[PDB]
UniProtKB/Swiss-Prot annotation, chain A:
The gene is GTF2H1. It is found in: Nucleus. Residues 1-40, 41-77 form the BSD domain. Component of the general transcription and DNA repair factor IIH (TFIIH) core complex, which is involved in general and transcription-coupled nucleotide excision repair (NER) of damaged DNA and, when complexed to CAK, in RNA transcription by RNA polymerase II. In NER, TFIIH acts by opening DNA around the lesion to allow the excision of the damaged oligonucleotide and its replacement by a new DNA fragment. In transcription, TFIIH has an essential role in transcription initiation. It comes from Homo sapiens. Belongs to the TFB1 family. This is General transcription factor IIH subunit 1. Component of the 7-subunit TFIIH core complex composed of XPB/ERCC3, XPD/ERCC2, GTF2H1, GTF2H2, GTF2H3, GTF2H4 and GTF2H5, which is active in NER. The core complex associates with the 3-subunit CDK-activating kinase (CAK) module composed of CCNH/cyclin H, CDK7 and MNAT1 to form the 10-subunit holoenzyme (holo-TFIIH) active in transcription. Interacts with PUF60. The chain holds residues 107 to 547 of 548 of the full protein.
Swiss-Prot record, chain B:
The lineage of its organism: Eukaryota, Metazoa, Chordata, Craniata, Vertebrata. It comes from Homo sapiens (Human). Keywords: 4Fe-4S, ATP-binding, Cataract, Chromosome partition, Cockayne syndrome, Cytoplasm, Cytoskeleton, Deafness, Disease variant, DNA damage, DNA repair, DNA-binding, Dwarfism, Helicase, Host-virus interaction, Hydrolase, Ichthyosis, Iron, Iron-sulfur, Isomerase, Magnesium, Metal-binding, Nucleotide-binding, Nucleus, Transcription, Transcription regulation, Ubl conjugation, Xeroderma pigmentosum. GO terms for molecular function: 4 iron, 4 sulfur cluster binding; 5'-3' DNA helicase activity; ATP binding; ATP hydrolysis activity; damaged DNA binding; DNA helicase activity; metal ion binding; protein-macromolecule adaptor activity. This is General transcription and DNA repair factor IIH helicase subunit XPD. The gene is ERCC2. It is linked to Xeroderma pigmentosum complementation group D: An autosomal recessive pigmentary skin disorder characterized by solar hypersensitivity of the skin, high predisposition for developing cancers on areas exposed to sunlight and, in some cases, neurological abnormalities. The skin develops marked freckling and other pigmentation abnormalities. Some XP-D patients present features of Cockayne syndrome, including cachectic dwarfism, pigmentary retinopathy, ataxia, decreased nerve conduction velocities. A motif (Nuclear localization signal) lies at residues 139-152. Its main location: nucleus.
UniProtKB/Swiss-Prot annotation, chain D:
Belongs to the TFB4 family. This is General transcription factor IIH subunit 3. The keyword Transcription applies. It comes from Homo sapiens (Human). It comes from the Eukaryota.
UniProtKB/Swiss-Prot annotation, chain E:
It comes from the Eukaryota. It is found in: Nucleus. GO terms for cellular component: core TFIIH complex portion of holo TFIIH complex; nuclear speck; nucleoplasm; nucleus; transcription factor TFIID complex; transcription factor TFIIH core complex; transcription factor TFIIH holo complex. Belongs to the GTF2H2 family. This is General transcription factor IIH subunit 2. The gene is GTF2H2. The lineage of its organism: Eukaryota, Metazoa, Chordata, Craniata, Vertebrata. Its main location: nucleus.
Length: 265, 185, 109, 263, 329
């Protein structure tokens, strides 16, 4: 069955971003689209599941020279007294059948938390203690001692934007959407490329897919710089270099892990 | 009487709403259907669907069955259980008791009703201290004679405050009591 | 759980008994001592069986000649099965307490 | 209204080192500047209230629960009480060579619970916007990180702003602390001119802080390190019990003793 | 007692008809959502590494209102949107638990998978028997702790006790607050629970290097404008607006040191202070904690520092600060 074709038809226009990115991976003819998907009323229904007799009657009386309104009409249509009780018993039983398908912790080192990840003679204490004890025999010098005009003016100049302690562009708009779309594409493909990269996966069938994805990295990064070139030759302003870091770091991880694999071998 | 009430509820929309809220099962004279219905009722109780089992006080099912925790949580009694006043066997049984041992006919009749009601309503307290409420939808039980003939353990718990609650008031107090019993000891 | 009943000492398998159980046991012992037929009512569907059986067994041990045997009748066989289960549990508890088998027989027809 | 709390780090070791150095700045002038700041805070409005806490190696003590010079009676009482209590505390103090690092987490905890008590007692009609103007004066202690982080998170939940005013040293823990709760962080390099910094940067309350230009916040280095040699690490291997940042993958983390299963 | 610091929790809300009944002072659904907003915010504030997910079940169908995420604001917005939900239909425990199981099946073993079903309508119409699903839940070690409303449901009682969770029924709104606040805290790890090391990444806030030289412009990663500076990743190298967040590429949790430090108080619970009403030779009128006179005949003291704390001081210390001020010294 063409289940893949049916799913592609379903998502062709319902979701714009998914199909946009999937098509983009083919617009420049980067790779085959197989890997894309390889890696990644109520009343009538209730009666249908409730009454098997109604199911059989529907199968035998499928619309043929008749009308669904007439079929609806056929639905509602001491001997009768006991029939009602029997009908409730059977109907509740049918509904129920349809719903019934066939360590105390101990530690040895706690001061490590007291000094967490945050990083970092005797007569001196005596001298400082006595000196500070004798320091404050006089109090309330506020009248002049606390502040002076020259120091205050220096402080205000420092607080000025050009002073110390106080150091002090949305021009492009349409480029924003293009950058967002490119970032989404990079994320989409990096997701699969990094899906199993951190895990060692020392198996043949597991490593085959990482090798294929690593080649796909080369093949996608082949086309990325061409769009980069198109965008660059406009004004030579507001450089977009963050995208380069992702590609270069992915390449560095790829090559370093390749060297590590060779060393392990 | 059960069939007549069920038929009236079916003609009205009350029965359909009850069916929506919870599953409904009914008792019949034939033992096979009774057993099948009760077997499905137990599974309904185990599951979250729930079940409302309509039965007759004199029915053999009422005496044979025993209701425990999460089984027959709320016991509803629709009408005082009285045998038909036409069965001539009870006429001999009753007038002979009046003639000998000196028991009033009404006294023995009310005793036969209260004993049967206690039999069919005392199951929910089987054991293990499993909560449950017994609601009697009949103003006759509010009469002093019925209360006096009621078993002591039920009657002493019963109080005048809740003796003749309206339908809505009874529902509210039942909800509150179920809240209280839900929490652990 | 050995209860120092007024008449005698009676063993009991479960840990605790409600005051209504004390009242039941004392009234039942009064009836047995009087050796006269009587009637009594207890609410609980279960628990009454164990209390009654324990009191009857203790009374039999104290005065074996007074009571030849116990004839305990129940409405239905499915119900009497639960009674025989309770009696089996009580006998196991008493046998563990005594440390050995005793000439006691119990059966259902 | 506003409830201000000044947590002064009056560490005798460091302030007496300044006294021995005979530098221009002194603990007396620091206390006077803090006093002036509190007086101005209450001067702002009648409903406003203030409190003061000192910080010593042993413990931390509150410095605050006619018109002889023609003075406002309430501020006169504040001046007298703070002067007397600070002199008493500085004059009387035991010596313990083992413990010399200044204590700040306990003082901040006292401030937080004091603010909670005042918030409970005050009438519900008036809303209180409390603040803690921490004034550090010495290097922090490594062993206090955990408790200080607890109190900082409690302050974040309770909506109190920790305005740090470190001087002579940049405490990474304290800057991290104020960053979490959004309090301002000012590092005054001119100690003599400290009070001008208070009457501008710190004095304005949270109500008017947004609608005012103040020095930009300093970048915070949220570093992580393994429990072995104490060094920056970008990737941490924590477990589900210790929640401890470690060096490298190990069969079992020492602080856990759990029976980790390989895979 | 071993505690699972990292837990993926699903708050299953039922859009049943019974929620329409205004048993509480406001509408039942509105009250539950309003308080669940506070529950979500407090849960994130008391367990940053953990993440939450909301499944709304109505008309016999369960829909994921919000997938697993580390951002409380998004879930809060989802709650506010759901406040206006129609609230018609019947819930399905099988459907809701199956959706939760499908999402939680691929979750890492080390993290504790938990579900809190806020059950309102006692009925449970499900396509398949839930007793069978109970076996799969036990196999998958997904803790399920139901909170019933106005009903002691038997199927949910057995669900909770068999799966290891706890069952409760709302006595009133105040007790509802207490129940959810209690469920906020991490549950103790039982024998079935297992612990394993989890890879973690610690990013550093970065800005323009020097006067916007060699800048790193970027918009966001899950209408974001250009950002001069922000957080980054050791491996993604993709700008992140806020932390903590799971990597969109690596699959590794990015979280800073304070977020981890926020959970140490769980490992270090504070021992309850004995309450002595009498003064007991406590001549200090001022309470040490708050330096205020003790206006009530109550005092609290530790077993180490032996200090004095009033009612408010002790309550606050054991509730929020989670550490004794004087006893820190
Ligand atoms: Zn290391
Ligand atoms: Zn560990
Ligand atoms: Zn990443
Ligand atoms: Zn206090
Ligand atoms: Zn203490």
């Amino acid at each position: 069955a063409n289940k893949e074709l049916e799913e592609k038809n379903r998502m062709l226009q319902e979701d714009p971003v998914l199909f946009q990115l999937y098509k983009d991976l083919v617009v420049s003819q980067v790779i085959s689209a197989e890997e894309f998907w390889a890696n990644r009323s109520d009343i009538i229904e209730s009666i249908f599941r409730t009454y098997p007799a109604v199911k059989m009657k529907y199968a035998e009386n499928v619309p043929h020279n008749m009308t669904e309104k007439e079929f609806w009409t056929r639905f509602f249509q001491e001997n009768s007294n006991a029939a009602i009780i029997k009908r409730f018993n059977h109907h509740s039983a049918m509904v129920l059948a349809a719903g019934l398908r066939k360590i105390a912790l101990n530690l040895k080192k706690s001061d490590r938390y007291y000094h967490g990840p945050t990083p970092i003679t005797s007569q001196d204490i005596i001298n400082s203690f006595q000196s500070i004890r004798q320091e404050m025999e006089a109090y309330t010098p506020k009248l002049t001692q606390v502040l002076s005009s020259s120091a205050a003016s220096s402080t205000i100049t420092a607080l000025s934007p050009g002073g110390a302690l106080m150091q002090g562009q949305m021009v492009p708009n349409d480029i924003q959407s293009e950058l967002k779309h490119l970032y989404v594409a990079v994320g989409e493909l990096l997701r699969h490329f990094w899906s199993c990269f951190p895990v060692n996966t020392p198996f043949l069938e597991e490593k085959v897919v990482k090798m294929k994805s690593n080649l796909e990295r080369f093949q996608v990064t082949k086309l990325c710089p061409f769009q980069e070139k198109i965008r660059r030759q406009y004004l030579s302003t507001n450089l977009v270099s963050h995208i380069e870091e992702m590609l270069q770091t992915a390449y560095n991880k790829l090559h370093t892990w390749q060297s590590r694999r060779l060393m392990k071998k | 009487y059960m069939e007549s009430t069920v038929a009236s509820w079916y003609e009205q929309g009350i029965l359909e709403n009850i069916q929506r809220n919870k599953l409904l099962f009914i008792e019949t004279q034939d033992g096979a259907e009774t057993s099948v219905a009760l077997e499905k009722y137990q599974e309904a109780c185990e599951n979250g669907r729930g079940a409302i089992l309509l039965s007759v006080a004199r029915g053999k099912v009422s005496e044979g069955i025993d209701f425990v925790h999460h089984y027959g949580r709320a016991v509803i009694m629709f009408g005082v259980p009285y045998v038909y006043t036409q069965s001539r066997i009870l006429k001999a049984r009753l007038e002979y008791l009046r003639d000998q041992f000196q028991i009033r006919e009404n006294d023995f009749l009310t005793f036969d009703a209260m004993r049967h009601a206690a039999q069919c309503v005392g199951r929910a307290i089987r054991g293990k201290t499993d909560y449950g409420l017994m609601v009697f939808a009949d103003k006759r039980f509010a009469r002093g004679d019925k209360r006096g003939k009621l078993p002591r353990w039920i009657q002493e718990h019963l109080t005048d405050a809740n003796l003749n609650l309206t339908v809505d008031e009874g529902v509210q107090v039942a909800k509150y009591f179920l809240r209280q019993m839900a929490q652990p000891f | 759980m050995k209860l120092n009943v007024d008449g005698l000492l009676v063993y009991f398998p479960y840990d605790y008994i409600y005051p209504e159980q004390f009242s039941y046991m004392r009234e039942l012992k009064r009836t047995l001592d009087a050796k006269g037929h009587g009637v009594l009512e207890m609410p609980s569907g279960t628990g009454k069986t164990v209390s009654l059986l324990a009191l009857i067994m203790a009374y039999q041990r104290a005065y074996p000649l007074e009571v030849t045997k116990l004839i305990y009748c129940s409405r239905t066989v499915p119900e009497i099965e639960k009674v025989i289960e309770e009696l089996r549990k009580l006998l196991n508890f008493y046998e563990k307490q005594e440390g050995e088998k005793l000439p006691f027989l119990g059966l259902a027809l | 209204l506003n409830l201000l709390v000044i947590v002064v780090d009056a560490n005798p070791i460091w302030w007496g080192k300044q006294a021995l150095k005979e530098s221009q700045f002194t603990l007396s002038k620091c206390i006077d500047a803090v006093m002036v700041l509190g007086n101005s805070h209450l001067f702002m409005n009648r409903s406003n209230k203030l409190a003061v806490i000192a910080s010593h190696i042993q413990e931390s003590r509150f410095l605050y629960p006619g018109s002889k010079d023609g003075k406002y009676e309430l501020l006169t009482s504040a001046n007298e009480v703070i002067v007397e209590e600070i002199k008493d505390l500085m004059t009387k103090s035991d010596i313990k060579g083992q413990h010399t690092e200044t204590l700040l987490a306990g003082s901040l905890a006292k401030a937080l619970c004091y603010i909670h008590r005042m918030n409970k007692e005050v009438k519900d009609n008036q809303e209180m916007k409390s603040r803690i103007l921490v004034i550090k004066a010495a290097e922090d202690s490594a062993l206090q990180y955990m408790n200080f982080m607890n109190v900082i998170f409690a302050a974040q939940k309770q909506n109190i702003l920790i305005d740090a005013c470190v001087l002579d040293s940049d405490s990474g823990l304290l800057q991290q602390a104020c960053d979490i709760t959004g309090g301002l962080y000012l590092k005054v390099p001119q100690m003599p001119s400290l009070l001008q910094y208070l009457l501008w940067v710190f004095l304005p309350d949270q109500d008017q802080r947004s609608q005012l230009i103040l020095p930009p916040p300093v970048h915070v280095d949220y570093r992580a390190a393994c429990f072995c040699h104490r060094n920056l690490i970008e990737i941490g291997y924590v477990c589900s019990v210790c929640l401890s940042i470690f060096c490298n993958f190990s069969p079992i983390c020492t602080t856990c003793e759990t029976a980790f299963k390989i895979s | 007692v071993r505690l699972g610091m990292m837990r993926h929790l699903y708050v299953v809300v039922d859009g049943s008809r019974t929620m329409e009944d205004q048993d509480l002072k406001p509408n039942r659904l509105t009250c539950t959502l309003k308080l669940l907003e506070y529950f979500v915010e407090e849960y994130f504030d008391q367990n940053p590494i953990s993440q939450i997910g909301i499944i709304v079940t109505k008309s016999k169908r369960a829909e994921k209102l919000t997938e697993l995420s580390g951002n409380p604001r998004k879930h809060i917005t989802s709650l506010k949107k759901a406040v206006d939900m129609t609230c018609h239909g019947e819930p399905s425990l099988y459907n809701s638990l199956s959706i939760a199981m499908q999402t939680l099946k691929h979750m890492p073993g080390h993290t504790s998978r938990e579900v809190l079903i806020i059950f309102s309508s006692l009925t449970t119409c499900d396509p398949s028997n839930i007793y069978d699903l109970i076996k799969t839940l036990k196999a998958a070690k997904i803790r399920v702790s139901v909170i019933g409303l106005s009903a002691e449901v038997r199927v949910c009682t057995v669900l909770a006790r068999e799966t290891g969770g706890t069952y409760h029924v709302i006595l009133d709104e105040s007790h509802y607050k207490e129940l959810l606040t209690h469920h906020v805290s991490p549950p103790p790890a039982s024998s079935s629970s297992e612990c394993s090391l989890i890879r973690m990444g610690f990013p550093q806030h970065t800005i323009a290097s020097l006067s916007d030289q060699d800048a790193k412009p970027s918009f966001s990663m899950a209408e974001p404008g250009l950002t001069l500076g922000g957080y980054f990743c050791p491996q993604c190298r993709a700008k992140y607006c806020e932390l903590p967040v799971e990597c969109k590429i690596c699959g590794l949790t990015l979280v800073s040191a304070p977020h981890l430090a926020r959970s140490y108080h769980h490992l270090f619970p504070l021992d309850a202070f004995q309450e002595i009403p009498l003064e007991e030779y406590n001549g200090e009128r001022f309470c040490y904690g708050c330096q205020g006179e003790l206006k009530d005949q109550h005092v609290y003291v530790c077993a180490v520092c032996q200090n004095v704390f009033c009612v408010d001081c002790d309550v606050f210390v054991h509730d929020s600060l989670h550490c004794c001020p004087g006893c820190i010294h």
